[PDB]
Amino acid sequence: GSVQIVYKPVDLSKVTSKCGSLGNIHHKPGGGQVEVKSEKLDFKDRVQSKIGSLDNITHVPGGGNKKIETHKLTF
Amino acid sequence: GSVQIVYKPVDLSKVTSKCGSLGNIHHKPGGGQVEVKSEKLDFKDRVQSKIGSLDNITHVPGGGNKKIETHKLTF
Amino acid sequence: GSVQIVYKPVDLSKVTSKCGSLGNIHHKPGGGQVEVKSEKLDFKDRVQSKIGSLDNITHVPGGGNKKIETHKLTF
Amino acid sequence: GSVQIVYKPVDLSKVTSKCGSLGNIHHKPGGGQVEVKSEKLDFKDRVQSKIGSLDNITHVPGGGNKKIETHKLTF
Amino acid sequence: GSVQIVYKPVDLSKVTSKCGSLGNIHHKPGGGQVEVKSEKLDFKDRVQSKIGSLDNITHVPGGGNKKIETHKLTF
Amino acid sequence: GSVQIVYKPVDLSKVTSKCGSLGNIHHKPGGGQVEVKSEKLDFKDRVQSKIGSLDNITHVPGGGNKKIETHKLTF
Amino acid sequence: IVYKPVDLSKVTSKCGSLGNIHHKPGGGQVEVKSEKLDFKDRVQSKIGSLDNITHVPGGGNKKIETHK
Amino acid sequence: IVYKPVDLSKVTSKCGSLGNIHHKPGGGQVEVKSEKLDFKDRVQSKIGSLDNITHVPGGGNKKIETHK
Amino acid sequence: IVYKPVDLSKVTSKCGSLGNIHHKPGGGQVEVKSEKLDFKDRVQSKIGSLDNITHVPGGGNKKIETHK
């Protein structure tokens, strides 16, 4: 007798992340007038301030991919 | 008795991240007029301030890819 | 008794990151007029300030790729 | 006596045509397989033939504008 | 006696034509497999033929605008 | 006696034609496999044939603008 | 005597296939399938042909004229 | 005596196929399937043909004229 | 005597195939498939041909004229 082993696994797979703003159409978006009048203010602690008419903001901490393969043949 | 081992795994796979702002159209986007009038203000701690009419902002901490393969043949 | 081992793994795989702002069209974007008028302001701690009409900002701390292969044949 | 004529027409008008294919998204459009097998044909007059998987013909004989304007002051 | 004529017509009008395919989303449209098999044909007159899987013909003989205006002041 | 004629027409008008393919996104369009197989064809008059997988014909016989204007002051 | 006869006459024969139009004459598309036939005497066969045939044994003209 | 006859006459024969229009005369698909036929005498066969045939043994003209 | 006869007459034969138009004459598309036929006498066969044939044994003209 004899032993024949053929190990031909095939991987054709796709792992894909599509995360954020993709393929959107923005036709003539208009931000209105913005007026910020401030008088006699006191701030004791940290201030973060954002003022504007039209904002497109995309934040993507996600969309990571992890692929693990193990192949083991023992004789 | 002879032994034949053929170890021919094939990897044709794809791991892909598409993260942030991709393939978008912005046609004539208009930020309106912005007025910020500030008088008599006091800030005791850190100030972060952003003023503007039209902003496109993309932030991508994510979209990382990790691929691990292990191959082991033991006779 | 003969032993034949053929070890011919094939890797044609792709690992790809496309992170940030890619392939977007901005047709005639208009930032409006910005007026910042400030008087009698006091700041006791650090100030970060940004003023402008039109901003395109892309930040990509992400999109890293890590590929590990190990191959072991032990007779 | 005396005469005063103040002829000050103001024209801020718009005439616009937008004709054909504008602002569309065609995401991954696919024409399938086409086979034309042909044997023993006779054509005694003119032939126009067109063969193909995918098409995007944009044909615009139209659009376009006439502005005809006349100003006449007779004294 | 005296005469004063103030002739100030103000035209802020818009004439607009939008024709064909505007602002549409065609997500992954797919024309199937086409087979034409032909044998023993006789054509004694003119032939127009078209064979294909997927089409997006946008034909616009129309649209377009006429603006005819006359201003007449007679004294 | 005296006569005063002030003739100051103001024209800030616009005439615009936008024809054909404008601002469209054609993401990864695909024409499939085309096969034409022919034997024993006879043609006794003019032949136009066109064969191909993918097309994007943009044909514009139209558009164009006529602005005909006359100003006449007769004293 | 003044003797001045005039012949201005015409004698014409127009015989056979004259001035016809045959526009794309063509034909019905023809299949003949024949198996194990037997013929013991003459065969004439036409299959899909467009024979145009003219015979004119006639069409002759005769003028006799005589003067005294 | 003044003798001045005038012949302006016409004698015309017009015989056969003159001035016809045949426009796309053509046909339906013609099929003949034949198996194991037997013919003991002459066969004439036409299948799908467009024979146009003219015979003119006639169409002759005669003019006889005589003067004294 | 003034003897001044005039012959201006015409004698014409126009015989056979004259002035016809055959425009894209073409034909029905022909297949003949034959197996195990037998012929013991003459075969004439036309398959898909466009024969134009003219025979004119006639079309002759004769003029006799005589004067005294």
Swiss-Prot record, chains A, B, C, D, E, F:
Q: Domain of life of the organism in this record? A: Eukaryota
The record lists the effect of S17F as:
In PIDB; markedly reduced ability of tau to promote microtubule assembly
| Site residues (Not glycated), renumbered to this chain | K8, K14, K18, K28, K37, K40, K67, K72
Describe its PTM?
Answer: Phosphorylation at serine and threonine residues in S-P or T-P motifs by proline-directed protein kinases (PDPK1, CDK1, CDK5, GSK3, MAPK) (only 2-3 sites per protein in interphase, seven-fold increase in mitosis, and in the form associated with paired helical filaments (PHF-tau)), and at serine residues in K-X-G-S motifs by MAP/microtubule affinity-regulating kinase (MARK1, MARK2, MARK3 or MARK4), causing detachment from microtubules, and their disassembly. Phosphorylation decreases with age. Polyubiquitinated. Requires functional TRAF6 and may provoke SQSTM1-dependent degradation by the proteasome. PHF-tau can be modified by three different forms of polyubiquitination. 'Lys-48'-linked polyubiquitination is the major form, 'Lys-6'-linked and 'Lys-11'-linked polyubiquitination also occur.
Which organs or tissues contain this protein?
A: Expressed in neurons. Isoform PNS-tau is expressed in the peripheral nervous system while the others are expressed in the central nervous system.
Cite the location of the cross-link Glycyl lysine isopeptide (Lys-Gly) (interchain with G-Cter in ubiquitin) from the record.
Answer: K8, K14, K18, K28, K40, K44, K50, K66, K72
Which cellular compartments is it found in? Answer: Cytoplasm, Cytosol; Cell membrane; Cytoplasm, Cytoskeleton; Cell projection, Axon
Q: Where does the record place its Tau/MAP repeats?
A: 3-33, 34-65
Subunit relationships: Interacts with MARK1, MARK2, MARK3 and MARK4. Interacts with PSMC2 through SQSTM1. Interacts with SQSTM1 when polyubiquitinated. Interacts with FKBP4. Binds to CSNK1D. Interacts with SGK1. Interacts with PIN1. Interacts with LRRK2. Interacts with LRP1, leading to endocytosis; this interaction is reduced in the presence of LRPAP1/RAP.
What's the disease link here? In Alzheimer disease, the neuronal cytoskeleton in the brain is progressively disrupted and replaced by tangles of paired helical filaments (PHF) and straight filaments, mainly composed of hyperphosphorylated forms of TAU (PHF-TAU or AD P-TAU). O-GlcNAcylation is greatly reduced in Alzheimer disease brain cerebral cortex leading to an increase in TAU/MAPT phosphorylations. Frontotemporal dementia 1: A form of dementia characterized by pathologic finding of frontotemporal lobar degeneration, presenile dementia with behavioral changes, deterioration of cognitive capacities and loss of memory. In some cases, parkinsonian symptoms are prominent. Neuropathological changes include frontotemporal atrophy often associated with atrophy of the basal ganglia, substantia nigra, amygdala. In most cases, protein tau deposits are found in glial cells and/or neurons.
Q: What is this protein called?
A: Microtubule-associated protein tau
From which organism does this entry originate? Homo sapiens
Ranked from the top, the taxonomy reads: Eukaryota, Metazoa, Chordata, Craniata, Vertebrata
Curated annotation (Swiss-Prot), chains G, H, I:
Q: Where are the Tau/MAP repeats?
A: 1-29, 30-61
Site (Not glycated): which residue positions?
Answer: K4, K10, K14, K24, K33, K36, K63, K68
> Which residues get glycosylated?
K40, K46, K62
Effect after changing S45L: In fatal respiratory hypoventilation; unusual apparent autosomal recessive inheritance; reduced binding to microtubules as well as increased fibrillization and aggregation
Regarding tissue, the record states:
Expressed in neurons. Isoform PNS-tau is expressed in the peripheral nervous system while the others are expressed in the central nervous system.
N6-acetyllysine occurs at K4, K10, K14, K24, K36, K40, K62
TM helices/strands, residue ranges: none
Q: How is it modified after translation?
A: Phosphorylation at serine and threonine residues in S-P or T-P motifs by proline-directed protein kinases (PDPK1, CDK1, CDK5, GSK3, MAPK) (only 2-3 sites per protein in interphase, seven-fold increase in mitosis, and in the form associated with paired helical filaments (PHF-tau)), and at serine residues in K-X-G-S motifs by MAP/microtubule affinity-regulating kinase (MARK1, MARK2, MARK3 or MARK4), causing detachment from microtubules, and their disassembly. Phosphorylation decreases with age.
Q: Where in the cell is it found?
A: Cytoplasm, Cytosol; Cell membrane; Cytoplasm, Cytoskeleton; Cell projection, Axon
Phosphoserine PTM positions read S17, S45, S49
The effect of S13F is: In PIDB; markedly reduced ability of tau to promote microtubule assembly
Q: What's the domain of life for this entry?
A: Eukaryota
**Which positions carry Omega-N-methylarginine?**
R42
Q: Where can the Glycyl lysine isopeptide (Lys-Gly) (interchain with G-Cter in ubiquitin) cross-link be found?
A: K4, K10, K14, K24, K36, K40, K46, K62, K68
Q: According to its UniProt entry, what is the function of this protein?
A: Promotes microtubule assembly and stability, and might be involved in the establishment and maintenance of neuronal polarity. The C-terminus binds axonal microtubules while the N-terminus binds neural plasma membrane components, suggesting that tau functions as a linker protein between both. Axonal polarity is predetermined by TAU/MAPT localization (in the neuronal cell) in the domain of the cell body defined by the centrosome. The short isoforms allow plasticity of the cytoskeleton whereas the longer isoforms may preferentially play a role in its stabilization.
Tell me what disease the record lists for it.
In Alzheimer disease, the neuronal cytoskeleton in the brain is progressively disrupted and replaced by tangles of paired helical filaments (PHF) and straight filaments, mainly composed of hyperphosphorylated forms of TAU (PHF-TAU or AD P-TAU). O-GlcNAcylation is greatly reduced in Alzheimer disease brain cerebral cortex leading to an increase in TAU/MAPT phosphorylations.
SUBUNIT field:
Interacts with MARK1, MARK2, MARK3 and MARK4. Interacts with PSMC2 through SQSTM1. Interacts with SQSTM1 when polyubiquitinated. Interacts with FKBP4. Binds to CSNK1D. Interacts with SGK1. Interacts with PIN1. Interacts with LRRK2. Interacts with LRP1, leading to endocytosis; this interaction is reduced in the presence of LRPAP1/RAP.
Query: What name appears for this protein in its UniProt entry?
Result: Microtubule-associated protein tau
Organism expressing this protein natively: Homo sapiens (Human)
Q: Which gene encodes it?
A: MAPT
